[PDB]
Each structure stands twice: as C-alpha cells, then as structure tokens.
Amino acid sequence: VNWDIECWMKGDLTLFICHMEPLPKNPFKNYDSKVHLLYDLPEVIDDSPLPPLKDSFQTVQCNCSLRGCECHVPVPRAKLNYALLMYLEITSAGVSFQSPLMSLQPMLVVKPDPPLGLHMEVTDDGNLKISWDSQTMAPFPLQYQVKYLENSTIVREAAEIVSATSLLVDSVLPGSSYEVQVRSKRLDGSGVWSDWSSPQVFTTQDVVYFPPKILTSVGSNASFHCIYKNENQIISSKQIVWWRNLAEKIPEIQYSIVSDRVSKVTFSNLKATRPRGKFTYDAVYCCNEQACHHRYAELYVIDVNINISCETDGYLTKMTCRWSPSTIQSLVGSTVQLRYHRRSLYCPDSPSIHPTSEPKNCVLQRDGFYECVFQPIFLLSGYTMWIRINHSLGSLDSPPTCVLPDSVVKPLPPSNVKAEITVNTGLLKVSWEKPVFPENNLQFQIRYGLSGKEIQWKTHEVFDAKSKSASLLVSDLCAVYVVQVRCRRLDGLGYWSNWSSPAYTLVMDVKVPMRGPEFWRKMDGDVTKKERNVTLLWKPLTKNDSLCSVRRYVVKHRTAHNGTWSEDVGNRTNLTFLWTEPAHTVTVLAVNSLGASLVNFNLTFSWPMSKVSAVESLSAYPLSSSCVILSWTLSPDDYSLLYLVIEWKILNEDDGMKWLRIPSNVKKFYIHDNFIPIEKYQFSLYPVFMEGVGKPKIIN
Amino acid sequence: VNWDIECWMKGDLTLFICHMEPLPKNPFKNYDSKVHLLYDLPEVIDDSPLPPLKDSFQTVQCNCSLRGCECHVPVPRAKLNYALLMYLEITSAGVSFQSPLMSLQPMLVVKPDPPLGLHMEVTDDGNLKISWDSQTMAPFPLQYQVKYLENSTIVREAAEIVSATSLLVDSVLPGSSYEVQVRSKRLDGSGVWSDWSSPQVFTTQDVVYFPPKILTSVGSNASFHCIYKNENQIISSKQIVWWRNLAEKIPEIQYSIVSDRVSKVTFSNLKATRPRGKFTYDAVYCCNEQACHHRYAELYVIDVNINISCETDGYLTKMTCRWSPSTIQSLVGSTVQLRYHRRSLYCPDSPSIHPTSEPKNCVLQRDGFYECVFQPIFLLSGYTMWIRINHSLGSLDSPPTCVLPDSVVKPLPPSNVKAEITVNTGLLKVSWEKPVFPENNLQFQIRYGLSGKEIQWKTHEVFDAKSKSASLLVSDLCAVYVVQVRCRRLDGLGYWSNWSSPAYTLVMDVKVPMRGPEFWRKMDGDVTKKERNVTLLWKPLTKNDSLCSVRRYVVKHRTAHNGTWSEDVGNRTNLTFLWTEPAHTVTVLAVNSLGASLVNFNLTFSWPMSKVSAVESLSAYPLSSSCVILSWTLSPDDYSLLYLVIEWKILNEDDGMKWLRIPSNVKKFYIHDNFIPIEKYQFSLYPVFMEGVGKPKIIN
Amino acid sequence: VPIQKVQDDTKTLIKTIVTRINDISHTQSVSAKQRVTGLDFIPGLHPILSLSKMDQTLAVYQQVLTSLPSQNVLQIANDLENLRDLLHLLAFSKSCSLPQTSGLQKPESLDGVLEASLYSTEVVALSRLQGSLQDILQQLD
C-alpha cells in the first residue's frame, strides 16, 4: 500500500496537519483502514544515542475519509522549533504497516493564511496601487505573489511576486476594470504557498478624480486630480479644463499637469461652501476644455471658527461655557463633540488640541447655542477646549481654546443697596453690601436717576475695593431718586454683576422754609367801629421757598398788651382776626418738619399811622387788556417807606380782590393781567412803614 | 446485646423521639439488624385487668444508622397525657429479641427547643438586659439556664438559671465584650435540657449612651445617659460634662446622677431643629470635663402639626380633604398617610386618634396639596382624621381632627338670575331660582354694578331664605347693570356658593322724555310774499330731558282755520314749513317708547304783532373774544312778554345764526362765544308774546 | 512666568477658598478648643514652616478628605490639587533643588473613623484646614 503524504504546520501555529492520499485509486472499497500517528516531542537535546522508549510516543487517531486521511498533531508554540519525531501505524484487514521514523521541525514547514484586506486605490500620479494587509501573527517574513488582470479593451494578465504588502500598476486606464489576487508564503525555508485571497475588482471610470472628495476647511487648500477619457481616447491633461459647479471654469493657472493623462487642480484658501440648494459641497469638474463629464469632484469646506464663551458663577461653583453651531448646519450629518483637556497648569500661550481629551456633554437650547457646564471646576487649571466636528468625510477640530475660570467670573449684584439724602448736607448717601467674593478686589459701578416713567440714569464707578458707602450730589433735594449698583473685578477680569435692585430715597425736608409767605389783609369792619376784623391773606410757598414742603402756617401776633403770641393756621392761607389794640404786629411763619421759615414778612396795623398819607398822586394808564401803568408821586416828607402795596379789584365785585407788594421806591408800575375796559376798577396804592400802613391812595 | 435508649418528646408535640445507641462498640459490623417499635395508645382507662390484644399494637420501623437507631412515634396532641404502651422488637442474624413492655406519658418527657431572639440592652441605670423569647407553643413552664462570658477587663463567665425570659446584668463595663449562651428545660417533670443556643454577642464602648437616639417633638422632655471610660478608668458621673453639638455646654442643672459611673442629662420644652448645612439634628456629648469622646448621643426633634381642608360638595355625595406636605419635607424617607376613623355620632369637642383608623388614599395635585376625596358620605357622622408620617425612625401622627360633612358644604350657585328694570319705579329687580339644598336654609348674596370695563360692584344681602327675588335702588335708569347672586347656608355654615351668572339689565325708556326741545325758526321767504318758509331750528334732548331716549320728534302746529295737526319729524332737529295764516303756533314733542314729551314750549307766529316792537333799544358790549354783553331797553308798555330770544350771527354769514331763549325779565345779557372782532355780528332781540312774536330790535 | 503674579495668585486663591469654607460652614459654627478623640491623624497643633512639611500636610489633607463623600468638598479638592501643584512650582522658584518625594501614608485609622464619625470628621476637617491655611497665610510673608 502506497500513500502520498503531505504535512504542514497550520497557519495559527497550533496544529500540525498531515494529509495522506492512498495510491492508486480504489483497490480498497470495503475495509476499515485505521491509521494511527505516533509522535514524540523531546524536551532536552542531549547528545546521547539512547533510543526513545516505546512508551514516550503519543498516539494520534487521524481522520480518514474516502478522499484521504488527515492527521492533526497539536504542536505547542514553544516546541515549534524542536525536532518532531514522527512515525505512522496503518492497520488494514488485520495487517499493520509501520512507517519509518520521521524527524521534522514544524516552524520550517508552515502554510500561512491567505493575505486579507486587499484594498485598491489610485495614487495622485494616476498609478494603480494595490494594497493588502499582512498577517500580524506570522513570526516569519511573508512573500506575496500578486495576480492582477486588466480588463481594458485589451485583456492583460500579470502575476507578480512582492515582499511588501502593496503593489503599483502604472497608467490607470480610465474605464477599465482590474481584479487582483494575493497569496502569501514564508520567505525563508520550504514554506508552503497560501491559497489565493478573495479577488478584489476595481473598475475605473472615464474620468477619475483622486481624491474624488476633499473635506477641507476655510482657508485650507484642496488638491484634485483627473484622468479624463473621451470615448476611447484619454484626454491629455493639457486639454483638461477644470470647472467648479460647472458655473466657474477653474483658471488654467490652477491647472497642474501631474502627467500627460493626469491634470491636477489645487484649490487654495478655500471659502466655506455655500449651500447650493441640496448641494453642500463645491462640485469640481474635470472637463476636456468645455466637454465637462457628468461626474465631478466633491469639495467640502466648513467654517471651523466657532467662538466658545465660558462664564463662572458668583458662588464660584460652576463654569458655564457656550458656543454656537451656526457654521456647522451647512453640512447635514456632521457630528460635533467638544473635546476638553484640563491642563493642571495655567493655559498655554498657544492652546493646543490635547491628545488626552475628554468627551464633554453640551445641550442645544431654544436660543440655538450649546451650553457646557463644567463641574467640579479647577481654579488654576488650564481647561483646553475644542469642538470635534466628526463629519462622514472625516473629523474636524475647532482651534483649541483654553480657559482659566478666574477671568470669566460674573459677580453677584451687591445686596441691600440703600439710598438716602444726608440731612443738612443734601448728599445722596448710598450704602450697599458686598457679595461674597475672593480678595474683595471689586470695582463697583452704581447707576442713579430720578424716579419716573423714564429714569435718566447717571452712573459712577467705585475703584476703592474697601468702600461700602458714598455720598453723592443730586439736583433735586425733594424728588425721588432710583439707584442701582453693579460690581466687577477691579482688575477688569471676570464680568460685571447684574445691576442691583432699585434703591429709593425717602423725601424729607432737608431744611426749614427759607422765607415766610407774603400776606396782605382784607379789612372787615366799620370804620366807626373800633373793632375791625382783619382777614390776613397770603399764598402758599413755592418749591424754592418751601424747599421740599411747608407742613403748616403759623401766624405770630405781637401786641403791647398781650405781648407776642403765635397762631397756627396750618395749611390754610387766610386768617381773619379782630383788630383791638392800637398796635398789633403780625408775622406769618411757614413751618416744615424741620421748623418755621427763617426769614418772615411782617405787617403792622396802627390807628394813628393809618391816617398818614405819603402819596399825593396816582394814575391808571391802560396800556392794553394785558397791562396797565400806575403812575404816582410820593411825599416830599421824609417818610421811611418800607414798600408800596398795589391794591386793584373790580368795583361791585367783592371777589375780584388782587394785591401786590412793590418796593417803596417805585413810582410807575406795569400790572400784566387780563383787563376788561367795560368794568370800573379800583386801583389802590399802599404806603407801608414801621409804624404801620399809612393812609392809601385809591383811584377808580 | 446491650443497648442505650434515650426517649424524649419533640418540642412541636407531634413526634416522640427514642434515640438509641448500642453497647459496646462494633461487635456488629456486617449484619442488617432490624429494629421495630410496637406501640399502643389505649383510648379508655378501664379498670379491667384484660391483657391488650396482640393485634392492637401499631408497628413503626426504626431508622438504623452506623451511630444508632432513632425511632419516631407520632403522638396526637389529644393523647399526650395518656399512657404510651410500647415494646421493642430487634431482629439480627436471624434472632429476634423482644424487650419488656414499658409505660410512659410523652407529656412528662419532652425536650424543648432552644429559645430565640437573644438580645442584650442597657437599662438607664447602666445595667445590661439579656433578653430572649419564650416558646409560645410550649404548654408547659420553662426554666432557662443563662451562661454569660463577660469578656471585660476581667473575663467573667457565669452560667445562671432563670425562669424569666430576661436577665439582669448590672453596671455595663465600657470597652468590653460579652458572650452569652442560654438553654431551657421543662420546669415540671423530668425536663430534658435544651441544646445551648447560638451565642449572641454585645460589645461595649468606653463611652456608652442610653437611649443613644431620640426622636421627639417640639415642647417635649427627654433624657440621655452616659458611662464615660477614660482609658482603663470609668469616668464618674460627678465628672462627666455633657455637651450639645460641642458648641453648647449643657447646664449641670439639667444633669443628674443615676449611679456614679452613670451620667444622665435631662432636657425640657424642645423646639424644632435647624439643619446645620447638610447636618440635620442636635448632637449630645458625654465628656469627662473637657475630655469629649468621639462618640455621641443623637437627638431628633420635630414640630408635630398638619391641617387638612375638607369640603362637602353641593350635591352632598363627597368630601374632598386637602392638605399640604410642606412641613414634612425635612426628613428624607418619611412616608405620610392620612389615617381616619369615622364615628357614628357627631364630632367630639376633642378629636382623638382612634385605634380603629382606616388609611385614606390622597392625590397630590399640581398645586402641591394632597387631595383626600371621600365617597359616599353621611353628613351627620364625625370623621376623626390625622396625618401619619412614617419616618425610618418611628411613626408619628398629626394632631387628630374631626370634620362633619354637613359642616363643610358648599351650596350650588343660585340659578335663573335675571336682571330687569321695574317700570315707573326705577328699581333693580333681581329674580333667581334657588339651588337644591336641605331645609332651604340658605342665605343669598347679590352683587351689582355698572356694565363696563370696570364694574363698580355693589353688594346686597338677602337674609330671607324664602325670597326668590329682590328690588334694588338705582340712580341711572338708562344703563346696563351686571348682577350676580351667590348663596350659602342660612346658618352661615359651610361655604358660600360661587357667584351666579352675570345678570344684565336691559335699557328701556322708564318714562317719557321729561321735556320737549326748545326750537327757533328760520325765515326762508321775503316779507312781500304772504307765504314764508318757517325753518324751525331746535336741538336734541340731553340725558336728563330725554331721560333714557327720545325716539322721535314730532312738531305740532295750530292755526285758526286748519285747527291742530302734527308732523312726525323723527330724529332731525329742524323743520321748514310754509307760513300762510294770521295765527300759527308750533310745538315740538320728544317721543320715546312710552310716549311724547310732557313739558313743551310754544311759539306763535302772528302777522299783526309781527309789527309790534316791545324792544326799545339794543346794544352789544364785547367783554372779550369769549364774551359779549347784550343790553336792551323794553318799551314802557305793559307788554306781557313770555321770554326774549337772542339771535346773533356773523354778518354776511347766513349759516352762522345762533339763537337762545332767555326770560323776558332779563335786561342785560352776556353771550359766551368765540367772538372775532374783525367780523361784524348781527345781534337781534325778538320780543315774544303769547299770540305771536313781536317785532325784533336788531344791531350790527 | 513672573513670580509676583504667582504669589498674588496664591494669596487670592487661598482667600477665595477661605470664603468658600467660611460660608459653607455657616450652619457649622465651630468651637476650636474641643478635642474629640480619633482625628489625631490630623496634625495642625503646630506652626507650619517648610515647603516639605506644609506640602506633606496638604497631601494628607487631600488623602483624608478623599474619604469624605460630598460635592462642595470635591470642588475644594480641585482647589487644593491646584494649590499643591503650584506649591511644587513655588518651591522650584525658590531655586532650591530639594528632591520632591511624596506619599508615605496609611489609610486605615482614617477609614475606621470614617465609618465611625463622618459628622465630626468633616467638621474638624474644615475647621483645622481653616486654621492650617490661616497659619500658612501668616507664614507666606
């Protein structure tokens, strides 16, 4: 019985396989031939010619089939270099056949697995690059035989031996198909050739763009190449005219001739691709002059300049980082991830995209931005930031940005801001409470303005980080002021605090009235009657005389008998009192919360002095319905006239009373008031003295 | 052959166990000895010396092992006190050995099970209590043997026999360990001692608190205890200083000494506890003066209080009890439940947490209140209710509260609320339909106000539970009023019903317009023609004159020949009619829905006295651009003038005629109008008589 | 980098953490005189002088508070890792080439007290580190 025996070590270096084929065919059709393999793996190479003991060989029962017997001998990887003692025991029809002892080394006879990953590509020069993946577990170099067949108009078959994992085929023929097969073999020793790998077929097109796509950025450069074939002829690169979106012939200055068949266009300083309806890419066309083939090259230019803004809370608890994806929606499908590395140190002068970055989770809001809260935060640690725009055509990284939390702290508005006008100085003094913050190095900004529908805000800055209150100069001492304060870092870092709550001062009389009201009298009582009611008549003080307010009017009376006594009139502007003494001195006082008016008017009533006349003439000259001149002459007697008081009223009218005190030096006056010529008027001139009001002068 | 036999009744009183051990060891190593227990349980104690029949004994096959044979005799609990007649049959090596008959009562020989629930606790005197359970299933007294192993600074093991289920152990040693074991035996009879139980260990600290943890309420009284061990020395109670949170030292007035080794602190009138940052209670400290142990006694104090708003619907089918969990939110893990007990009688003056209380499901609404809805209800039953909050550290109850369903009824709103104006009286009559309610004891409330953007609501109460309508005084009889009627129980119990539908008053003419309009006449036609167009000129009635409205004007005329006729003039305020008769008078009526105006003026046109001039002179004195004086003299003739009519206009302006009726007694008049001096004004004074209009006096 | 800004940075950040601890420990006003047993593995009854000794004290500080389970504490831990690195840098800026050896601690008694008295442990931790940084800021001048 004859056997054709082939033995090889399995590609995994774990099993030694012996395949056996009986010779010749079918003299054995009804016998159970049991083939037993006995193998030995000695562990010590001892130079002693001692025969191996018969109990040392391990017996392997081989799998025998109708086509042959396969023997599976487990060879340890550590013993792949050892001498494998081998012999066979074949028993058939009661007869046992023993083969002579065989010695072999499993490592020398290895059949590797077929090469995998047979990729196919076109180089920028227009060459046809075959590539495949080497077996990473082979402890020996592998020699590869590559069989590629060119399915062009002429069928070309080539089988090439290579030690590398790639092969190059020259002159890519456009519109041609290439199928490649690669098999491996150990370079050194009697290695057994691996079976051919799966054939990889690559069919070229009439126009070949390589790279057919470029995902690039704004300002970046993209280079596209072409092998243009018209019908059966390859268009020369000199004849290749490039077009972008078929609406812009790329200038021939941008044409670079890689070869007589390869024309190259290189875009430089690329602008972000405007979305062309459903096109988010710039279509780059290889054209034989004007004959633009229906296929093009895709150019993707994205704007990776996204600003990310970060803020630190006043409780110093969290960072709030935000940014907007506005430059990202141009490309549908791009997945953007902020990648952060927190450098333990402060941020570098040049923030760098750190290889050890961590994924960060951020939320798109209703405002269109993405917030990124960092917690816990590290004060002196450099937080290197950048977005990773993972597009299907490649991942794009925003320029790395690093943030130190201190310079992005927005302050808390100070608490309990108080606004008030200091008394007797009128200084609006404002006090506020400093919120909790490091170093208290806070530059405070206040804003103040009058209370109303529209507050004309006035601001002031506080550079002293120690100040807690300040007094301010305001225009109206009796109008309500609204005050708000905001604070920031004195160094200018961080942010400004929100403006504080509106602080309202309380209106109070900062000082007493400054002048008493002008008061005249309505003279009630018969002349024959010694008692005569004197109806004092004054007017409320102005905002300047009252400053803020007059809470009451006090009329102080003085007599020789009753001495001096004062009568509070309160808010009333008139006072009727009886005249009983020859001299009765009257003074009306305007009183506010701080007291009476300092300087007050006085008026004396005297029976003897009421008879004295200092005026001899008085004349009413009507200038118009809005003015009349009163002209009068005063006595040559040295009358110490305080002032003259002009009395004018409508005759027959007891309520057309009007009066006016004028200086005693006046001889002619202009009464500007609505004047009706129809009615008769009583113009009265009153000489007023120390002793009282002298006898007046009246003209009708 | 000799055998050792032990028999006892099992603790469950279901199996009688006879344990057996052969004597001596192993003369029988290869024989299958069959041991049988033949037993009898006679049912009648008859005093007849009749030997038991051999067929009455029941046979049980014993389970024999290499260590001995165990025979299990099932004894009914009803026959435990009966005499158990039994004998043993042992078959070994073909030889049968029969034991003499033995009589015993299984109740007198029972081996109890070991006690369970072994616990060690410290009394407030510092004394340890070793506690365990008594076996309830045992119908017989037990005596327990307690072996303790004090593993203190001095190791003290002592075995003590007690009949109670707890052991007094004095003066717990701080910083020490203890091992205790207990076994039991029947107190009466030949009790077989139980096996020793599992040793329960209770180890001490150099400082021991008792009771270490307190859950309590606001205002209550409590007490902690301590035993301080300084190193190997137990600190005296006279020397233990107590501390709370180590920030407040407890006054020694609140200390107390139980024993010199045992310190105790006492507190009274607790208040609610404030969380300390995250820490939420008060930490009591036992300190050797200033030597504070790292261990502590913990105090929980909570404010016990919870209300609940129950309301009975107007249809009297349900309560809705609602309450806030706002005060429960402090202790995490606290679980709340409304526990109610219903009472067949009315609510007691003091609601009490009744032992028979049921749980109520309550739904938290979006408002933050728990909603407890009860259905079906009985209005006269007192529902005693309280909130049970089950914190992890105990169960506590809100103050119990009782609610009467009839006492929380909200009646349905009054219906058919109708707002109408009573005619000829001007009274706001509001009629409505009463809601369904028992006893009709309802008090109704009516609110009304002007219909507009702001309804100045005016309220009026209807105490009469029988009243279905009410009348209200109003001042404007021609305006729309919004009226609503709400009700509540007449006794005031329960709630108010919600306000009814807004009842809107309709505007109708309550009365005819109170006067007819004043009209003048415009002469369209020369003097020469006997026929003259009398263009009457009047004005619409004001609010008072029209009252509510003037639906139309109708001008009535009279003549000597044609009698009296009327012209429906409608809304227009002028009437041009031809004058043809010697005596012709005109009257205009203001007609509303109820009829024509009551008071109406007259103006007769008469040819003969159209020549009669009752005005001697007439003059115009312009006081201002806004005023002109008219003065006139009448003829000294006894002219029975009804009134005077002043007609003035700008000359050359035929559309600027203005007229006014004035009483005939007036001699000087003041006309207020925008008088432009450059324009010349025609002032005409018409004398008016009963029988016609006199000849006017006209000035330009 | 200039060292004056580093020094000012140290002073500012330490006083910021002072504010942090101060207002966190608001519901935790302390009486510094009481010694409770079992936190001896916290020194601080002593002035701190040398860069090595303060450095190691701080390292132990970190290590002991690692057992502390909180979040405000975690932010403070970030703060102290920053401060530890910067004190390495300041020791370097001293131009003293003393080798920077570290570690050498045993986390057993710490964990026993941790499983014992988290309350006292955290409060004494905050308070004693307060005093520690107080003496440190005294010593920086």
Numbering used by the authors:
A (entry chain B), B (entry chain A): 125 to 824
C (entry chain C): 1 to 141
Q: What did the publication describing this PDB structure actually write?
A:
Leptin is an adipocyte-derived protein hormone that promotes satiety and energy homeostasis by activating the leptin receptor (LepR)–STAT3 signaling axis in a subset of hypothalamic neurons. Activation of LepR in turn drives the phosphorylation and activation of the transcription factor Signal Transducer and Activator of Transcription 3 (STAT3), which drives production of anorexigenic peptides that suppress food intake and increase energy expenditure. LepR is a member of the class 1 cytokine receptor family which includes the related receptors glycoprotein 130 (gp130) and LIF receptor (LIFR). The structure reveals an asymmetric architecture in which a single leptin induces LepR dimerization via two distinct receptor-binding sites.
To stabilize the leptin–LepR complex, we engineered a construct comprising the complete extracellular domain (D1–D7) of LepR with the transmembrane (TM) domains replaced by dimerizing leucine zippers (LepRD1–D7-zip), thereby enhancing the avidity of LepR for leptin. Recombinantly expressed mouse LepRD1–D7-zip formed a stable complex with mouse leptin in vitro as assessed by co-elution over size-exclusion chromatography. Analysis of this complex using single particle cryo-electron microscopy (cryo-EM) yielded a 3D reconstruction of the leptin–LepRD1-D7 complex to 5.9 Å resolution. Above the leptin-binding regions, the membrane distal CHR1 (D1 and D2 domains) bend upwards, resulting in a highly elongated structure with a total estimated length of approximately 180 Å projecting from the cell surface. Below the leptin-binding interface, the two-membrane proximal fibronectin domains (FNIII, D6 and D7) of LepR bend inwards towards one another, forming an approximately 90o angle between D6 and D7 which is predicted to bring to TM domains of each LepR monomer into proximity. Notably, there is no direct interaction between the two LepR ECDs, suggesting that receptor dimerization is primarily ligand-dependent, as has been observed for other class 1 cytokine receptors. The asymmetric conformation observed in our structure suggests that a single leptin molecule is sufficient to dimerize two LepR chains and activate downstream STAT3 signaling.
